[PDB]
Design a protein around this ligand. Sequence first.
Ligand SMILES: C[C@H]1O[C@H](O[C@H]2[C@H](O)[C@@H](O)[C@@H](O[C@H]3[C@H](O)[C@@H](O)[C@H](O)O[C@@H]3CO)O[C@@H]2CO)[C@H](O)[C@@H](O)[C@@H]1N[C@H]1C=C(CO)[C@@H](O)[C@H](O)[C@H]1O
Length: 1025
Amino acid sequence: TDNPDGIDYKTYDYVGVWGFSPLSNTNWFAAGSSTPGGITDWTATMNVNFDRIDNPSITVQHPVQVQVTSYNNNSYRVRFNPDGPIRDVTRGPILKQQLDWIRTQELSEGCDPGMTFTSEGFLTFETKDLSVIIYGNFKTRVTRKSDGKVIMENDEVGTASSGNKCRGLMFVDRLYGNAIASVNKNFRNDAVKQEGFYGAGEVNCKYQDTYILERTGIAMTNYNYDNLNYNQWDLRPPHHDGALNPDYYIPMYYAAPWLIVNGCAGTSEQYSYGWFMDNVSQSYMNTGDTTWNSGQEDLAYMGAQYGPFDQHFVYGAGGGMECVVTAFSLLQGKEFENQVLNKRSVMPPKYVFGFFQGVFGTSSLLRAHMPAGENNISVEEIVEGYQNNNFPFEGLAVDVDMQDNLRVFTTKGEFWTANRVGTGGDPNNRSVFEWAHDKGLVCQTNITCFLRNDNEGQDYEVNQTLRERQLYTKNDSLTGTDFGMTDDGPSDAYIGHLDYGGGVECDALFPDWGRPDVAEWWGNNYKKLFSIGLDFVWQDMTVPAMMPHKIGDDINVKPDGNWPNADDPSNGQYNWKTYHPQVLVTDMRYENHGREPMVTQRNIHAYTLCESTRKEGIVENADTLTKFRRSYIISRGGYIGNQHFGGMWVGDNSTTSNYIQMMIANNINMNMSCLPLVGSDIGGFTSYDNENQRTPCTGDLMVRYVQAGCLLPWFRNHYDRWIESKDHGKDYQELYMYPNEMDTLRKFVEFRYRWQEVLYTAMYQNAAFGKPIIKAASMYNNDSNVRRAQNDHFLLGGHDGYRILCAPVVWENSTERELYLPVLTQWYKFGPDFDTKPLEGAMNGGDRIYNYPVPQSESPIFVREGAILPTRYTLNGENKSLNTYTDEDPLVFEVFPLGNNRADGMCYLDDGGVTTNAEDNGKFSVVKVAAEQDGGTETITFTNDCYEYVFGGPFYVRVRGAQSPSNIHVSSGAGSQDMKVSSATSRAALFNDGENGDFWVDQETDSLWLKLPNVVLPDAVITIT
Ligand SMILES: C[C@H]1O[C@H](O[C@H]2[C@H](O)[C@@H](O)[C@@H](O[C@H]3[C@H](O)[C@@H](O)[C@H](O)O[C@@H]3CO)O[C@@H]2CO)[C@H](O)[C@@H](O)[C@@H]1N[C@H]1C=C(CO)[C@@H](O)[C@H](O)[C@H]1O
C-alpha cells in the first residue's frame, strides 16, 4: 500500500531557493476561474479551475476549501490537494479537533462569519474585525472594518488574452513536478506602508557586517539540516567562490514556514498578520528577493517541493505583532484536551531555567577513574570548578561520552562512582546522574534516534529489539536506489552512519516513526535512563543528522568535501546529510496511510521524534523518573508546534561576535514562531581560531556572550572539547576557567537567578496565553523608532511582559553601544550591580543615545516604571541550584518606581516540577499584585487567580524610593495587623531572624522591606501611610 495517491516523484535532491521559481510562470498552474461548491459549517468549497499560466487552454479542476478558523482571532485558512482527495493530517501543529473546539466555543458565543456566496459566485465572509471577499479567479482582498484598509491581497499575473490568473494558488503541472506555491502583493517599498516581514525560525541574515532581525526582501527555505556553523559548505549557492558566511538562503535546524507581516509600523493605522504554510516537505518563503530572479521586489510568496496545499492567515484579536503570535498558538492549542495548564505549550520544570554546563569530551564521572589522555576532563572537575567558585550552577549536559561505545540509552563504567554499570539505586555505585543529584544538580543527557549496528558481536538490546519487531526504516525505494549494506544487516534495513569527527563514528539503524508500536517502543527505552537518575532530555542529531554519503560509496565513506556542486550536481546520489531522499518511510503526517519517500515530509522527522519522547517517554514513564516527576526536552530540530514537547537550542554555533548577534535574533524570531524556550550555546559550540583550533573563547567575548543570554530562556554553556581521544575542539570554556572575568561572569548568573520567577512566570504566560517570552522591539506599539533598534533590542518580563528591556553589547572589545529607550514610558538602569545599591534617576523613554557607555562589567538592561518583579534570594546568602531551592529562600515582590502612580506584577507558583500535579490537577497559583499612590497613602494589593499551591515561607514587598513610614497596615483574610519596625538592620538578618510583620528601612538600597507571613500571599491590602 505504498504511495496510495499515484504520485510520480520528479524531485528528490535539495533545491536551493535559486532553483525555486514560481514567479517563473512556466509549467505552473494558477486559479483562472471558479463556480461555488457549497458550505457546511465554516468550510466553504470553491470548485476552482487551474490554468497553465503559459498556455491557458490547458485546464484542470480541483476543489479549494476556504475555512474560517477563528472569528474572534481573525484567522482563516485555504487548502486544496491537487494530487488527490483533501486530507486532514493526524499528526502536526494544527489538528482537526482543536479547530473544531475553537469553532464550537465561538458558536456558543454566537459568532457569525456569515460565510456566504454573492449572486456572482464570489465568496464573502467576516471575522471579528476583518471582512474578506474572494472572486472568481480566487483574487483575494482582506479589508479591515474600522478604517476600510486593505491589509492583505494576493497577486495576479495577466496573460495574452485569457483573463487574469491568481498566483494566490499555484501547483506545477504534475507532468513536470509536484511543487506548490502562493503569492501576495508585498508593500515593502510602499512609501507609507513600508511592509516588513518577520519570523522564519532560525534563519540568519547578514547586512554589511551585522546580523539582523528582519526577514524582508530575501529568499529563504525550510529544509532541516545538520548545519554546523549555520554555513555548511554543501549548502552554498551554485558556483560560490570563497568562504560561505551564514545567511538567509541557508536553511537551519528548525522548520518554520511562517511569516509575520508588519506594515504602517508604529502608528494609528498599523496592521499585522501571520502566514503559515503548513507543509513539511522542503518549503520556501520569499519576501521579494530578486537574487537569482527567484522573486520580484513587490511580491512575496511561500511554496513547497510537494503537497498538499494548506495555508493559514492569522491576523489576531487586536493590536500588535505579539497578538499574531498568541492567536497562532491558539490554533495549535490543547484547549480541546481540557489542558488545565498546558494550553499553548508544556511547562518545563523550574530547573530548566538555571545554568548548565555541557561538555563534548568528558571521559569519566570522577577523577579517580579518568583514563589518561591529553586534556581529558571529568565531570567531577567541572562541578568542582563551578561549585567551589560559588557559581549559581544547575548541573550538566552529559554527552555521548557517557554512552557505551556510542550506544544510545546506556552508560559505560567510567561514568559511575565505582567504575562499573549498575542497575542503579546502589549507594556504593552511583551513576553520573545520581552523584549529580547528591551535589544538588540535575542533568539532561544526549539522545539521538541512532541505534548502533556495527556491534562487533557484542550484545546491544536496543538495536536487537528493533530488528525483532521490524521497527526500523527499510531500504525500499520507488527508484531501485541502493543505499548501501554492511555485514551486520539486516538485509532490508536502511543503514546510515554517524560521524562526530576525529574517527568517532558508527553504522546505525533508525525508527520508522510512521509505524504504530514504534512510539511505544521508543518511549519505553528512556526507562533505562530514568531509573538511573536522568532528569531531562537532550534530543540531538534529529534530522536525522547522518554523515554525508554518495550512493555507491561504502557506508563509512563520505564524498569529497566539495561534492556535490553546480558543476557536478547530486543527481539523486547525495544523502544531504540524512536518509537518502528516496527512502520509503511510513507516513508521519497521515496515519495508516502507506509509505512515501522522505523527501515529502523531511521537515517532520524531528517533530515526530520529539512527540514520541514526550508522550511515550517522559509522560507515560513519569513513574520511573526519580527526583522530579515533570521533565522537559531540549531539542536541536523540529517543526512548528514542537513547543508542546519542550524547547530548543540552536545547534552548532561558534565563538565570534556574529554568533552572539545571531543567537539573539534567533531567540527573538523563535519566540514569535511559538518556540519561546530556546537559546543558543553560550560561548559558542565549535572552535574558531584558524591558526590553532584549540584556542578557547576570549574572556571579553565570554562576558558579552553570557550578558546577552543570561536572560534568554535556555541558558547553557556547551562546547566541543579537544581531548586526545577526539582531535577537534577547544581546550576549555567553563565559566570558572576565566580568572580575570570570574566576578563579572558569576554576578550575571546570580542576577538571572534572582529573576528566575520572572522567567518561570513568563513561561506560564506562554502556556496559558501563548505570549512570547522574548519580545521583538517591533512588538512595543506606537513607537516609530523600535524597528531600527530591533536587531539587538528586545523585551521581556513583568505582568504584561514588556517590563524589562535588554540591549546587550554585541561586539568583542567594545565599551559602548547605540541605545534606544522605547517611548511613552520611563526606564531604569538595572543589572547585577543594582540589587545592593539605589537606583539611578529615571531615563525618559523615547531617547536615542549614541555611544551609551557600557564597561565590560555591565550590560544594558532596564526595568520600566510600573514593574513589580518576583525575585528570589537564598536564605544563607550563598549560590545554590534552583532545583534545591525551597520555600524558605525568600520570595520578593520588588516594587519599582511608579508609572502614572500605578505598578503591577504577576507570579506563577508551583512545586517546581517535583511532581506533575500542576499540569495534571491544576495545583498551581497565580498571584497578582498592584500598587497605587494616592496623596499620602500607597496601597499594595495582593489578590490571586487561584491559590492551589501554598507557598510555604514568608515573602516580602520591596518598595523602591519610599523610605521610613508613619504606619503600615496589613489587611488579610486572617489579618488586621499593624506592622512594627523590625529590629534587624541587615537584609540578611531580616530574612533569617526577622519577625513576620517586620518592616526594615534599607538606607543602603533606598528601599523599604516588608516581611509578611506565607498565608497573606493570596489576598491582602497593605496600606503605607
Ligand atoms: C560534533 C558535531 O559532529 C558533526 O560536525 C562535523 C561537521 O558536520 C563537519 O562539517 C566538520 O566541521 C568542520 C567544518 O568542516 C569546517 O569548515 C569548520 O571550520 O570546522 C568544523 C569543525 O569545527 O566536522 C564536524 C565535527 O568536528 C555533526 O554533524 C554535528 O551535528 C555535531 N554536533 C552535534 C554532536 C554532539 C555530540 O553528541 C553535540 O555535542 C552537539 O550538541 C551537536 O550539535
